[PDB]
Write a protein that binds this DNA or RNA. Structure first.
Lengths: 816, 85, 233, 285, 63
RNA sequence: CGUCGCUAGUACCGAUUGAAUGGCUUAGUG
């Protein structure tokens, strides 16, 4: 067959990933799914696009849906971009190189937040896997990681390499000592979940699920072993919804600290720290007011503490925007004015500039300098059509109608409309028809660039589907009104000719390429086929478990394929109304299934974001191509069949176009290494007068003892038995050095005693023959220290038991 | 005296003589101990006809309330906006 | 859910909840949305007539047919504030214990472990503290710390040492802890502590077994003087 | 967890026929068409069920004893007719039964009276049903007007269906032998259902059958009959004891029915009585 | 021996193991069943010649 | 000793002109 692949993707400015900003008023780099886009704020269009590679639909592309980049984080000085993907792989990028600088895969979940250190060597990585792994770009490895947090990493702050603060989704904030790799102290950031953190100077502010935002102080040199991060007060903000991101600004000349809090609702609420002598002036004033009120000195002091948070900071402005913001960034700083960039859930980027002087801003409301909507669509595409001439793509969603040229991938014409459900496009590229849920039928002409005629009362209910005859004279409408209505064009306006009653509402309408007959879907799970010339019922198609979502008619017109929410795609023979075969293609509901023109084969798209190619003759999936991260709402095929387009809830539009050591033996080796080492250490010291042990990070005597401890007991006696004498002499040297270290002896005395007795018993004749006078001293010394150790434990045992029974006797006498 | 189960619900005490309070265990050790328990428990004429009823597929059981259910005890077997949206 | 007839029904918490007085004398609180008895309040032994609520049910008064007036007052936030505070103390203690063990301040770690009831940390604090001692019983400060334990803490400690003693690999640690306590407390006082003697009962047999052991390991030791005296010849 | 559910609906606590001719006769008199689905009540071991399955497109067996259902299952397992048998276990008087053209039943005698009307009230009822009843209950169904056994049950069933005797079954034909004799009858439900209110027909039939051998006029002399009927007239006016007395007097006099006995009355006689009260505004039920 | 090959061959076609695993068309599975059954019957590993007498019998049933 | 599961709970993402309440407000009554 002929393989299919995805050539070029568009239609989305960026996904729900953080905004990354570079000055230029500024330029913003925001990513779309796996690819990265750069949008200049002044122009409103992208300067350039950064794409990883591995185009979707290619053989080398992985079957499973690709992971989008959740978090983009940049360092200007190195000119490098860190990309965090859903799977967990972190890819280092350079905007100039246009490729991946470095690939890091150590996180099992998506990366929550990121940070380049100023040096650029270390990149702090935070993931939802509850682990912070500090990644070294120049080292190409993770030097270490932090695991104490029990929930996802909502934020972290590391300006100084020495110390680190991290805040978790659970709500516990834990200061970290990096060199020791342990958390210094733990306090709850909030009773609820903590999602936002920000450190500046001594000041620490955190926001939780509740409205109130908590102010903290941290004294890095306190070293009190307690109260390292402490709260003075909590100030209640207006928005009950939390703040995902907190970023601050100060101007050194101004000496004023402004900041925003990016909330999960559209409004971003902002706050400003008051200037200290003004706070001092306010403190004096409030003391005055209290004296006129008559409060006592103790009362006067009390009110200062409660209002102390109010003394510190005040709101300079609350900025409100048209669309919900996924992320925001502090772009520009100036005492004269502030300018901010924010990326919206509706895929449009808004940028606001506000001037202020002294306490409050001059402008009562924020003003938007620029926007990015030319390439942006506010709502997901419900219905897509391909132009007959094949050089125009018609895109329809709520309150918007977009036409996209194939080569440019840029919107040539934008049309205002209603909640359009289905889109249809007449032959010759003159007109397009849109059907709204409100009941109105909207007709536009590309040359007019405006609506010709609207019939609000065409259908009282929603026009859930629409189709045209091959001649195009008759327009077939299927609506929730339970009646199929036929509209005939006249010269241009539409007039109603005939209506067909039906028992249920119409889900879809499909007119055959030959125009002989019309197929109708209904809610009762049944498909019906009517003769178009006579409007007489011809045959039904029964047995579907759930309603059919789409109906398509093959070019030969002998077979139709019904796609239904039951997740089974069924092909039906019209000549006699039989189902030739049924396939469970997708794990979720199948929206649309389209015959390839002049081919029995068909594409299919479903809620679970899987789009598949199926052969009519083989009746099996030709190719499984997975590109979207969300439900693929609709699919349209070119007249030639060269290219096919799909739309997903992500707002992205994709164009698809065809191209061994034995027990005891290890003890022998371990003994040689350590005894070689201890002989050296003694050898080196007398003169003054290996790699494995370093990795073990234990003493040469300690390393062997782990080996001895490692040996299983049942094989231990045989291990000693096979052991030659020359190594037994080494093993006696081992004990003496172990015996020198008193701490290790008592920890493992019982095991050492049994081994020594077995060896001496098993080599008593060999031992006695040896004439080494030094060997006397080794056996003598081990004896004296062994006796003290054994006697000590015995004396403690006999001491305890004797008094232990004494207690029993005394209790008996009392109760007896 | 013989070591038994933990008296406190929040602790695990093995026969080894070691007690394990749940709070101090790290997540990884919590997982294996759960798996360790799993292996321990894993190894640890009317009936003859009832399996025949469950063996057969073409048997429908009617309860007192009148509903039809299979032998296993499970019931043997729309909004326009939801289906299309 | 009411065992006897319900004679008063009044809404509280705005729409959210309804309180019902039953002829059993039982005042039941229900969630209107889910219709489930959240709480069952029993302050009367007789059947009820009057159920007056104030401040959206923050204050509830129920009168008994006997002539007893019983007043309930809302304390949900009060209870929630309490548990919140204890969690703050518990998390602080858990961290501080961890810091001390890394630092090696076994004495402070010892106190925290007993309060938090952490056996492994109680194992590690004593085990490696003994190791430092090996390099009166444990050390002057920790020995003093052992002296100050209250009756409840002593019983908790003795519950462990019993469980420690039975295993030969760990009896060594427990005995020294027993040694310190007998050496740093009035032995008379230890006997009055209820339940101590039954703990004392289990330690004795295992102590004797370990005493027969070790003595035997001692006994095998003059295999080495048999080596010395023999080759001296 | 089969025991979990089957034990929740049953506790797991009958005279079995041993005469092959009656089973052969019952199936033979059914005259089963090849394109008919049969509801079989009381399959028992399956001796009747297997024969029906041979000549039936489908057979739906309904059983009360989980013991006996399995023996049906074992008998038919791995057979060409296995696909054509569906066994419903449990009470079937409460469940809405499926479509069926013929009903062959070794019916439990306890549910004999409910069963006969469930078929009659079954929407689109079976065209013919071979039911096996006892002599006493069956003879009431077959009882004709003027006979000793003529009763309300006969009057009610006869107008919604025709019942005909097939054969007599002796108590020896079963073991352990029942204390009562047995019989087989054929019930043919009328299509279309005679358009008379189910309640009204019962209402008139009941008040006159309180004493079947007593005059109809006397049956309306009871004080409660006037009170229950008087309020029924108050219902007619909403959407007077002397008046309803007089109205009853005219009806029984004009129809010449006030001096005869319910035990000696035909369908037409009651229908005429049913009309004459409707004209004067009296509705029974 | 032969058992080990059976599990591996079945597993390669997806004939064994849990189906609801998170993180092949059925008819082709049936085709695999036929291939597995015929392949693991050496009598009908392969047997030496002359073991079976199917050809002699079938030729005769034709007669 | 591991990986993936199943159950309970906590929160998260956006679609279901999601639905239902209330605050203000356009316009029409009053």
């Amino acid at each position: 067959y002929q393989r299919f692949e995805q050539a070029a993707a568009f239609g989305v400015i960026a996904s729900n990933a953080n905004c990354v900003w570079i000055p230029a008023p500024g330029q913003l780099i925001t990513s779309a799914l796996e690819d990265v886009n750069i949008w200049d704020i002044k122009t409103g269009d992208l300067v350039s696009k950064l794409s990883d590679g591995l185009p979707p639909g290619a053989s080398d592309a992985r079957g499973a849906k690709p992971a989008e980049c959740t978090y983009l984080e940049a360092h200007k000085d190195t000119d490098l971009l860190a990309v965090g993907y859903a799977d967990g792989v972190i890819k280092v990028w350079d905007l100039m190189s246009k490729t991946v600088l470095l690939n890091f895969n150590g996180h099992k979940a998506a990366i929550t937040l990121l940070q380049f250190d100023g040096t650029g060597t270390r990149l702090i990585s935070g993931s939802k896997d509850s682990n912070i792994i500090v990644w070294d770009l120049v080292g190409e490895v993770g030097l270490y990681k932090l695991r104490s947090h029990k929930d996802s990493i909502t934020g972290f702050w590391c300006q100084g390499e020495d110390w680190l603060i991290s805040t978790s989704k659970d709500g516990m904030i834990k200061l970290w000592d990096l060199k020791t790799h342990q958390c210094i102290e733990t306090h709850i950031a909030h009773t609820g979940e903590c999602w936002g953190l920000a450190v500046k100077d001594d000041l620490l502010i955190t926001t939780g699920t509740d409205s109130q935002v908590k102010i903290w102080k941290l004294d890095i040199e306190n070293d009190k072993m307690g109260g390292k991060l402490t709260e003075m007060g909590i100030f209640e903000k207006q928005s009950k919804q939390r703040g995902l991101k907190i970023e601050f600004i100060t101007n050194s000349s101004d000496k004023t600290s402004f900041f925003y809090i990016q909330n999960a609702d559209k409004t971003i609420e902002t706050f400003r720290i008051r200037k200290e002598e003004e706070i001092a002036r306010g403190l004096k004033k409030r003391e005055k007011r209290l004296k006129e009120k008559g409060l006592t000195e103790e009362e006067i002091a009390k009110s200062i503490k409660e209002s102390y948070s109010s003394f510190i900071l005040h709101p300079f402005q609350t900025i409100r925007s048209l669309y919900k913001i996924k992320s925001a960034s502090w772009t520009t700083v100036s005492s004269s004015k502030l300018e901010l960039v924010l990326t919206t859930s509706s895929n449009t980027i808004e940028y606001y500039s506000i001037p202020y002087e002294k306490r409050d801003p001059t402008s009562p409301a924020p003003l938007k300098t620029h926007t990015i909507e030319l390439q942006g669509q506010r709502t997901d595409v419900r219905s897509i059509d391909i132009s007959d001439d094949n050089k125009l793509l018609a895109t329809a969603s709520n309150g918007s109608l977009k036409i996209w040229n194939i080569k440019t991938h840029k919107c040539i014409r934008t049309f205002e409309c209603g909640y359009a459900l289905t889109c249809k496009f007449l032959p010759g590229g003159l007109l397009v028809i849109l059907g709204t849920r409100n009941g109105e039928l909207q007709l536009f002409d590309l040359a007019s660039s405006s609506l010709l005629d609207t019939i609000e009362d065409a259908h009282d209910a929603a026009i859930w589907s629409l189709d045209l005859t091959s001649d195009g004279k008759r327009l077939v409408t299927g609506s929730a009104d339970k009646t199929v209505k036929f509209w005939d064009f006249k010269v241009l306006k539409l007039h109603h000719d005939t209506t067909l009653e039906l028992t249920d509402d119409i889900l879809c309408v499909r007119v055959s390429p030959d125009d002989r007959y019309l197929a109708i879907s209904l809610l009762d799970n049944t498909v019906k086929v009517f003769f178009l010339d006579s409007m007489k019922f011809y045959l039904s198609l029964y047995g579907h478990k759930l309603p059919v979502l789409s109906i398509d008619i093959s070019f030969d017109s002998k077979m139709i394929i019904t796609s239904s929410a039951d997740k089974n795609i069924k092909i039906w023979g019209l000549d006699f109304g039989d189902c030739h075969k049924s396939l469970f293609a997708h794990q979720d509901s199948i929206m649309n299934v389209k015959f390839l023109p002049q081919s029995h084969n068909f594409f299919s798209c479903s809620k679970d974001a899987v789009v598949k190619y199926w052969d009519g003759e083989k009746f099996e999936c030709i190719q499984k191509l997975y590109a979207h991260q969300s439900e693929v709402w609709a699919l349209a095929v070119a007249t030639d069949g060269g290219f096919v387009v799909s739309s997903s809830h992500d707002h992205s539009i994709r164009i698809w176009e065809e191209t061994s050591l034995k027990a005891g033996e290890r003890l022998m080796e371990a003994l040689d290494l350590g005894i070689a080492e201890i002989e050296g250490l003694e050898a080196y010291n007398r003169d003054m007068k290996n790699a494995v042990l370093i990795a073990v990070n234990k003493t040469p005597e300690q390393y062997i003892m782990d080996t001895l401890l490692r040996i299983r007991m049942s094989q231990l006696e045989d291990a000693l038995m096979v052991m030659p004498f020359s190594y037994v002499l080494k093993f006696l040297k081992f004990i003496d050095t172990v015996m020198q270290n008193k701490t290790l002896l008592h920890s493992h005395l019982p095991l050492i005693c049994k081994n020594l007795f077995f060896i001496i018993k098993f080599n008593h004749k060999e031992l006695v023959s040896q004439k080494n006078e030094e060997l006397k001293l080794q056996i003598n010394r081990v004896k004296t220290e062994l006796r003290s150790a054994l006697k000590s434990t015995e004396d403690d045992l006999g001491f305890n038991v004797q008094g232990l029974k004494f207690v029993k006797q005394q209790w008996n006498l009392r109760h007896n | 005296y013989n070591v038994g189960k933990a008296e406190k619900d929040g602790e695990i005490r093995l026969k080894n003589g070691v007690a394990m309070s749940k709070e101090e265990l790290t997540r990884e050790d919590k997982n294996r101990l759960r798996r360790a328990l799993k292996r321990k428990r894993s190894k640890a004429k009317r009936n003859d006809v009832v399996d025949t009823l469950s063996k057969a597929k073409n048997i429908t059981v009617i309860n007192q309330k009148g509903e039809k259910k299979d032998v296993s005890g499970k019931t043997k077997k729309p909004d326009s906006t939801n289906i299309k949206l | 859910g009411h065992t006897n007839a319900v004679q008063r029904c009044s809404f509280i918490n705005k729409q959210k909840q309804l309180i019902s007085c039953g002829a059993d004398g039982l005042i039941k609180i229900w969630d209107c949305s889910s219709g489930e008895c959240l709480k069952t309040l029993d302050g009367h032994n007789n059947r009820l007539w009057a159920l007056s609520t104030m401040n959206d049910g923050d204050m509830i008064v129920s009168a008994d047919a006997d002539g007893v007036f019983q007043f309930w007052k809302d304390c949900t936030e009060q209870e929630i504030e309490e548990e919140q505070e204890k969690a703050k103390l518990q998390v602080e203690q858990e961290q501080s214990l961890q810091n001390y063990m890394s630092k090696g301040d076994w004495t402070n770690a010892f106190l925290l472990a007993m309060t938090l009831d952490h056996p492994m940390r109680l194992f590690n604090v004593l085990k490696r503290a003994l190791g430092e001692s090996r390099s009166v019983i444990f050390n002057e400060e920790l020995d003093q710390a052992i002296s100050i334990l209250n009756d409840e803490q002593l019983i908790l400690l003795m519950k462990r040492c019993r469980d420690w003693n039975t295993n030969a690999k760990t009896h060594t640690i427990a005995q020294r802890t027993i040694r310190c306590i007998l050496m740093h407390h009035n032995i008379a006082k230890l006997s009055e502590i209820p339940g101590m003697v039954k703990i004392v009962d289990a330690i004795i047999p295992y102590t004797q077994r370990h005493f027969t052991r070790v003595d035997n390991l001692v006994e095998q030791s003059y295999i080495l003087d048999y080596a010395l005296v023999e080759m001296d010849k | 967890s089969a025991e979990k559910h089957l034990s929740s609906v049953f506790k797991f606590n009958q005279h079995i026929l041993k005469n092959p001719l009656v089973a052969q006769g019952i199936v033979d008199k059914a005259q089963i068409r090849p394109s008919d689905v049969v509801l079989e009540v009381g399959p028992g071991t399956g001796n009747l069920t297997v024969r029906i399955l041979e000549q039936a497109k489908n057979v739906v067996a309904v059983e009360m004893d989980p013991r006996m259902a399995a023996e049906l299952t074992k008998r038919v397992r791995g057979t060409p007719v296995e696909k054509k048998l569906e066994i419903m276990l449990g009470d079937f008087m409460k469940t809405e039964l499926p479509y069926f053209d013929i009903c062959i039943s070794n019916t439990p005698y306890q549910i004999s009276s409910p069963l006969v009307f469930k078929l009659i009230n079954q929407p689109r009822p079976p065209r013919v049903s071979i039911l096996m009843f006892q002599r006493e209950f069956a003879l009431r169904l077959l009882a004709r007007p003027g006979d000793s056994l003529y009763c309300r049950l006969s009057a009610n069933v006869q107008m919604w269906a025709n019942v005909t005797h097939i054969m007599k079954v002796g108590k020896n034909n079963f073991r352990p032998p029942p204390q009562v004799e047995s019989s087989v009858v054929r019930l043919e439900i009328k299509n279309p259902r005679p358009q008379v209110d189910y309640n009204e027909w019962d209402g008139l039939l009941r008040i006159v059958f309180v004493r079947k051998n007593r005059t109809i006029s006397a049956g309306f002399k009871s004080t409660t009959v006037m009170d229950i009927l008087e309020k029924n007239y108050k219902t007619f006016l909403a959407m007077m004891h002397d008046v309803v007395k007089e109205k009853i007097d005219t009806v029984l006099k004009e129809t010449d029915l006030g001096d005869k006995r319910a035990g000696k009355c035909d369908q037409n006689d009651f229908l005429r009585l049913l009309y004459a009260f409707h004209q004067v505004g009296i509705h029974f039920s | 021996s032969q058992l080990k090959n059976l599990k591996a061959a079945l597993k390669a076609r997806g004939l064994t193991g849990q189906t609801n695993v998170k993180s092949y068309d059925r008819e082709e599975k049936k085709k695999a069943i036929a291939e597995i059954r015929e392949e693991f019957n050496p009598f009908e590993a392969v047997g030496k010649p002359g073991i079976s007498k199917q050809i002699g019998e079938e030729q005769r049933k034709r007669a």
